Design a protein around this ligand. Structure first.
Ligand SMILES: [Zn+2]
Lengths: 59, 59
């Protein structure tokens, strides 16, 4: 048994295990931001139609 | 340290690392097939946006 190496390996595994989770969280939020972005798009076009309609109402 | 406890923790760290990797693999594979299903819809949407983009060319 290598007491120095096993403590070092556990520190390496724990450190990297944390690196892995935070990478996913970033991705999760990134996907979360992307989906909400395309959600807005459907409403933006609907909004644009209303404006254009209101513009042509003024006649 | 505690050689018995640290080795058991080391086995736990590797174990948890395997679950995360398999969790990613599960997600990736599920996502890979899922994207292929929605892919026809996505190109159709891209075309209408592109078409509408082309419509606004009039100046
Ligand atoms: Zn030891």
């Amino acid at each position: 048994h290598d007491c120095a190496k096993v403590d070092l390996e556990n520190a390496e595994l724990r450190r990297k295990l944390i690196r892995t989770k935070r990478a996913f969280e970033d991705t999760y939020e990134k996907l979360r931001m992307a989906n909400k972005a395309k959600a807005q798009v459907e409403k933006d076009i609907k909004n644009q139609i209303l404006k254009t309609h209101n513009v042509l109402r003024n006649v």
